[PDB]
Paper text:
Piwi-interacting RNAs (piRNAs) guide Piwi argonautes to their transposon targets for silencing. The highly conserved protein Maelstrom is linked to both piRNA biogenesis and effector roles in this pathway. Maelstrom is composed of an amino-terminal High Mobility Group (HMG) box and a predicted carboxy-terminal MAEL domain that is a signature feature of the protein across the animal kingdom. Our studies suggest that the ancient MAEL nuclease domain evolved to function as an RNA-binding module in metazoan Maelstrom.
To explore this, we crystallized a fragment of Bombyx Maelstrom (BmMael) containing the MAEL domain. This reveals an α/β structure composed of an amino-terminal linker helix followed by the MAEL domain. The MAEL domain is composed of a central β-sheet composed of five strands (β1–β5), where β2 is antiparallel to the others. The β-sheet is flanked on one face by three helices (α8–α10) and on the other by two helices (α6 and α7). Despite this overall resemblance between MAEL and DEDD nuclease domains, one striking difference is the presence of a Zn2+ ion in the MAEL structure that bridges the bottom of the β-sheet and the loop connecting α9 and α10, which encompasses η2. The Zn2+ ion is tetrahedrally coordinated by E137 from β2, H293 from η2, and residues C290 and C302 from loops. The fact that the Zn2+ ion was captured from the bacterial culture media, and not added during initial crystallization trials, points to its paramount importance for the structural integrity of the MAEL domain. A closer comparison of the Bombyx MAEL domain with the DEDD nuclease domain in E. coli Pol III reveals that the catalytic residues (D12, E14, D103, and D167) essential for coordinating two Mn2+ ions in the bacterial enzyme are not conserved in the MAEL domain. Intriguingly, an extensive hydrogen bonding network links these inactive residues in the catalytic pocket: N124 from β1 forms hydrogen bonds (dotted black line in figure) with both E137 of the ECHC motif and R306 from α9, while R306 has an additional interaction with D122 from β1. Interestingly, the construct lacking the HMG box (containing only the linker helix plus the MAEL domain) also showed robust affinity for RNA (129.9 ± 18.86 nM).
Author numbering: 90 to 280, 289 to 334
The structure:
C-alpha cells in the first residue's frame, strides 16, 4: 500500500494548493456511489450509480444518475441477484432488454468529469466511502473493456480522507476539525431519485446515499468559511 500513501499525498496535494491559491470554495469535487445486485464471477453486478458535483460555496450543483437493468441473471447466482434487488429496490434483469449502455456510460461519465479549460489529459477524482471502492473501481473497469479503454484514466479515492483534509486545511482555529482521520469516516457514517421516491425509500438510493454524504461534510466545512447552508443547495429543500 506504498501506493495508498500516494492516494493520501494526492488528496493533500489537491486540497492544500487550492486553498493556497485561495480558490477552494469554488473548486468542483466529485462523489460517486453504486448499488450492486450481487458479486458474480469476480465482478460486481452493478445496478445503480450516481455521480454528483459540489463546491463548498454552491453546494451540490447537480448529479448524474442512472438505474442499470442488466439483460440477465448470472448462472449460479439467482438467490444473490434476488437478494440485492430486494435490498436495493432494483428491478430484475431483462426488461425489454433496455440494456446497459456501458460503451455510452463511460463516455457520459467522462464527459461529466472533464474540466472546463483544462490543458492536461487528466480527470478529477471521484470520492466514495471506503467500502464502495472495490465496487466502483470494478464498475469503471467493466466499462473500459467495452471500449478497450483504460482503468488508469480514473482515480477512485476515499471520501473520508477527503473530508478530513478539506476541513483541516480550512480550519484556522484549533477548536475546528478532526484530530484523527477516524472521526471523518465516523461522521460520514453518522449521517433522491424519482423511482425510489416512488418506492417510498429512497433511502438506499445512490442519489440519496451520495447526497447525505456531502451534506455532512458541507455541514462541517461551510461555516468554517462563512457560507450560508442554503436549502436545496447545502441543506435539503
Ligand atoms: Zn435510486
Amino acid at each position: 500500500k506504498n501506493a495508498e500513501d500516494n492516494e493520501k499525498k494526492d488528496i493533500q496535494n489537491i486540497v492544500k494548493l487550492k486553498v493556497f491559491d485561495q480558490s477552494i470554495k469554488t473548486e468542483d469535487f466529485y462523489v460517486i456511489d453504486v448499488n450492486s445486485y450481487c458479486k458474480a464471477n469476480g465482478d460486481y453486478l452493478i445496478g445503480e450509480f450516481t455521480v454528483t458535483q459540489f463546491s463548498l460555496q454552491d453546494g451540490v450543483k447537480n448529479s448524474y444518475h442512472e438505474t442499470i437493468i442488466p439483460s440477465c441473471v448470472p448462472v449460479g447466482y439467482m438467490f444473490d441477484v434476488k437478494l440485492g434487488a430486494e435490498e436495493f429496490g432494483l428491478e430484475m434483469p431483462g426488461t425489454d432488454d433496455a440494456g446497459p449502455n456501458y460503451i455510452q456510460i463511460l463516455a457520459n461519465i467522462i464527459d461529466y468529469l472533464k474540466q472546463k479549460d483544462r490543458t492536461v489529459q487528466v480527470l478529477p477524482p471521484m470520492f466514495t466511502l471506503p467500502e464502495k471502492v472495490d465496487a466502483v473501481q470494478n464498475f469503471i473497469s467493466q466499462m473500459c473493456n467495452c471500449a478497450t479503454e483504460d482503468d488508469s484514466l480514473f482515480r477512485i479515492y476515499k471520501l473520508d480522507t477527503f473530508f478530513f483534509t478539506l476541513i483541516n486545511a480550512i480550519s484556522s482555529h484549533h477548536d475546528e476539525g478532526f484530530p484523527k482521520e477516524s472521526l471523518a469516516l465516523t461522521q460520514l457514517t453518522k449521517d433522491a431519485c424519482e423511482r425510489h421516491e416512488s418506492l417510498d425509500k429512497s433511502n438506499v438510493c445512490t442519489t440519496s446515499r451520495v447526497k447525505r454524504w456531502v451534506f455532512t461534510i458541507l455541514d462541517r466545512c461551510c461555516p468554517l468559511l462563512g457560507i450560508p447552508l442554503q436549502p436545496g443547495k447545502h441543506l435539503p429543500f
